Design a protein around this ligand. Structure first.
Ligand SMILES: CCCCCCCCCCCCCCCCCC(=O)OC[C@H](COP(=O)([O-])OC[C@H](O)COP(=O)([O-])OC[C@H](COC(=O)CCCCCCCCCCCCCCCCC)OC(=O)CCCCCCCCCCCCCCCCC)OC(=O)CCCCCCCCCCCCCCCCC
Ligand SMILES: CCCCCCCCCCCCCCCCCC(=O)OC[C@H](COP(=O)([O-])OC[C@H](O)COP(=O)([O-])OC[C@H](COC(=O)CCCCCCCCCCCCCCCCC)OC(=O)CCCCCCCCCCCCCCCCC)OC(=O)CCCCCCCCCCCCCCCCC
Ligand SMILES: CCCCCCCCCCCCCCCCCC(=O)OC[C@H](COP(=O)([O-])OCC[N+](C)(C)C)OC(=O)CCCCCCCCCCCCCCCCC
Ligand SMILES: CCCCCCCCCCCCCCCCCC(=O)OC[C@H](COP(=O)(O)OCCN)OC(=O)CCCCCCCCCCCCCCCCC
Lengths: 57, 459
């Protein structure tokens, strides 16, 4: 009573019902480094300008 | 200080839009108006310096140098308009532009509130001076003299740039007003020894120090007359101004770093006056006299007492006027005999009596005749160096004897004796020449009446 698969069937992506748990960390990665802080705030003008030796703007 | 910078820049369209017969008269007139306006800087106070802006200020040291600088431009235009009479109109306007631009650099060199602005203006004053010497100088040696003038100053001043940027990174500022209150003691180390050298050797070259003065009797001789006037009257005093600013920061290491340079200048004022005793070139005699006079200003800054600073700034102003007049007298004879040889034209009092009176008065101010400010500055430096060490009176007195000797030897050689027979193009003194001599001498004599405006920040 076995039926041979048609052209296209054995390459289908099928879904599998399992009882084992999903691997939560399969790469065994350690804790990632904390990122650098983002920039926040409103952008104020430069305090007394460029501060390049005598340039007052 | 912007009310003096803007008219000096407006002298550029005033000299390029003038009519071709009017380019001397207009620049002379309006530079005399700027020199009249220069007297507003005498708003000085006993406690505070006249502090204009974040960029410009003027204490009682920079103010006489400013008034002398703004007074020197019309006199340079009067001195230099006869030998540049046959010049192209465009090259004549370029010469006047270089003079105006050198004044423009100097008047914001002395008023620089921050020290790297002082450095930029201070080394900016090389370029119009170099162009004047190497372009409108007369003989072959002007190119070599421009090389020596450029490459002593930059060799001295490029360590000064690293020193000032180091102070900018350490103190946080090169504002002189802030550094009057944030100055820290500079202790003994080799790092601070080379700090002292980098802060001082540029100004030692510009004074000039004895042993480093070899740019000067070629740059002052091979320049034209306006170049010789500005080099003798202002550009040597840039060095003393920079010393009096920068020795705020160099304590207490100056109290033993000064000894070799005090020896060099106390012996150089003897040796260069002795050199003046045996000069054949009159213009070189005035050059080595300038070295001999600036040696005392170096000693007075390095001993850093109040009497020494007062005498040094008085002697700087007095020597500016006196040496500018001596170069102009030398030019007044060079435009007749076409030679700088001092023994050639003799007996000139028999031919030019009032010009010989101007020779007499400039030789008397050169030998520091009281009550001239020459003698005031000379005398205060001698008081302070005597309080420094009692044995320096030997060198100061021997210098004064040799100074009187070469001053009156110059006078007797050029003016007295039998006149030279084969010279017959000795014209009478022009009104321009006598007016130039009087505009040097009469402020120098009127400053004996009220001498407190040339005695610096600590009168
Ligand atoms: C209602 C709406 C409208 C309202 C309008 C209100 C205003 C009405 C007037 C409108 C016009 C305004 C014009 C500009 C304002 C004045 C700026 C000024 O004087 O700054 C002083 C500035 C700092 O002095 P301050 O006392 O602290 O400030 C006073 C003000 O508060 C200055 O204010 P500040 O604190 O904001 O200044 C900012 C800052 C202040 O500066 C700083 O923080 C210090 C750094 C300055 C530069 C240093 C460079 C050093 C190396 C270069 C050396 C150059 C040598 C000089 C030139 C040589 C020949 C080209 O300036 C800069 O960063 C700009 C750089 C310098 C340019 C100045 C403007 C020039 C405009 C015209 C150019 C014409 C040619 C002039 C010659 C070219 C060079 C200037 O001084 C200088 O820069 C010295 C030079 C003088 C500047 C030029 C004078 C302007 C007028 C020129 C007319 C004559 C031309 C003659 C013919 C051409 C030349 C042959
Ligand atoms: C603010 C108001 C001020 C008012 C008062 C002004 C104070 C004095 C200012 C300057 C004075 C000298 C300028 C004139 C002489 C130079 C040109 C010349 O040779 O003329 C000869 C000529 C007459 O001779 P000439 O026979 O026709 O022709 C000349 C000969 O070919 C050949 O000539 P020569 O060899 O036969 O004759 C030259 C003769 C030759 O004799 C000498 O060279 C000997 C002089 C040195 C030894 C004696 C004096 C020693 C020191 C003591 C005096 C000062 C202190 C006194 C106080 C008491 C003690 C503390 O020298 C004199 O006669 C000069 C007399 C005045 C001497 C002043 C000191 C000069 C010595 C060098 C500097 C010394 C330290 C500075 C002293 C500063 C005092 C203010 O004179 C005139 O035509 C005069 C022209 C106009 C002169 C105006 C002077 C002031 C102008 C200032 C304008 C702005 C302010 C407004 C006030 C105006 C008031 C009038
Ligand atoms: C006129 C011609 C001759 C001009 C002579 C000019 C002066 C001579 C000495 C100049 C030394 C170089 C500039 C030093 C600037 C000092 C700044 C500073 O922070 O110093 C402390 C610093 C200290 O280092 P630091 O600042 O990194 O460390 C902090 C300070 N401590 C050490 C306390 C922790 O000094 C130096 O780093 C080195 C200073 C000496 C450098 C020697 C090299 C130059 C040798 C002399 C050359 C002279 C000209 C020769 C050519 C002439 C023409 C052909
Ligand atoms: C002729 C041309 C025209 C003139 C140009 C300028 C000439 C003078 C310029 C240099 C002046 C001399 C050097 C500075 C002298 C002031 C005192 C000093 O440092 O003496 C040299 C030093 C003396 O020893 P001491 O000072 O006790 O050492 C501890 C230092 N923290 O001595 C020693 O320790 C031994 C020697 C050390 C190396 C000296 C040479 C390098 C430093 C100077 C450059």
């Amino acid at each position: 009573g076995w039926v041979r698969p048609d052209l296209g069937e054995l390459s289908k992506v099928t879904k599998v019902k399992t009882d084992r748990p999903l691997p939560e960390n399969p790469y065994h990665s350690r804790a990632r480094p904390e990122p650098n802080p983002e920039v926040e705030g409103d952008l104020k003008p430069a305090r007394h300008g460029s501060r390049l030796f005598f340039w007052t703007m | 200080m912007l009310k003096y910078i803007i008219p000096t820049m407006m002298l550029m369209p005033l000299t390029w839009l003038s009519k071709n017969s009017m380019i001397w008269i207009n620049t002379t007139l309006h530079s005399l108006l700027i020199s009249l306006t220069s007297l507003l800087l005498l708003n000085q106070f006993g406690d505070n310096s006249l502090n204009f802006s974040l960029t410009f200020f003027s204490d009682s040291l920079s103010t006489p140098l400013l008034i002398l600088t703004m007074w020197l431009l019309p006199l340079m235009l009067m001195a230099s308009q006869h030998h540049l009479s046959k010049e192209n109109l465009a090259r004549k306007k370029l010469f006047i532009s270089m003079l105006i631009l050198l004044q423009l650099f100097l008047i914001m060199t002395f008023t620089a509130t921050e020290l790297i602005f002082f450095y930029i203006m201070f080394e900016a004053t090389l370029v119009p001076t170099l162009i004047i010497i190497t372009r409108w100088g007369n003989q072959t040696e002007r190119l070599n003299a421009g090389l020596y003038f450029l490459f002593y100053t930059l060799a001295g001043s490029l360590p000064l740039l690293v020193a000032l940027i180091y102070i900018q990174n350490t103190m946080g500022s090169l504002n002189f007003l802030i550094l009057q209150y944030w100055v820290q003691p500079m202790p003994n180390s080799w790092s601070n020894t080379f700090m002292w050298l980098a802060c001082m050797m540029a100004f030692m070259v510009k004074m000039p120090l004895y042993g480093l003065h070899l740019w000067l009797p070629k740059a002052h001789v091979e320049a034209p007359i306006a170049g010789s006037m500005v080099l003798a009257a202002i550009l040597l005093k840039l060095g003393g101004y920079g010393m009096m600013r920068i020795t705020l920061l160099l304590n207490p290491i100056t109290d033993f770093m000064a000894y070799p340079f005090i020896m060099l200048s106390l012996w150089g004022m003897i040796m260069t006056s002795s050199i003046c005793l045996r000069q054949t070139d009159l213009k070189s005699l005035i050059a080595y006299s300038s070295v001999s006079h600036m040696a005392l200003v170096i000693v007075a800054i390095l001993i850093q007492t109040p009497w020494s600073y007062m005498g040094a700034t008085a002697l700087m102003i007095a020597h500016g006027l006196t040496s500018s007049m001596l170069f102009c007298l030398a030019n007044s004879n060079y435009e007749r005999v076409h030679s700088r040889t001092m023994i050639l034209a003799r007996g000139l009092q028999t031919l030019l009596p009032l010009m010989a009176a101007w020779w007499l008065l400039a030789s008397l101010t050169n030998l520091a005749l009281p009550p001239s400010i020459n003698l005031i500055g000379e005398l205060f430096v001698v008081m302070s160096t005597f309080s420094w060490s009692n044995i320096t009176i030997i060198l100061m007195g021997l210098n004064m004897v040799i100074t009187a000797l070469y001053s009156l030897y110059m006078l007797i050689t050029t003016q007295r004796g039998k006149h030279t027979h084969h010279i017959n193009n000795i014209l009478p003194s022009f009104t321009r020449e006598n007016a130039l001599m009087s505009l040097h001498m009469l402020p120098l004599l009127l400053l004996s009446l009220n001498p407190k405006i040339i005695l610096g920040p600590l009168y």
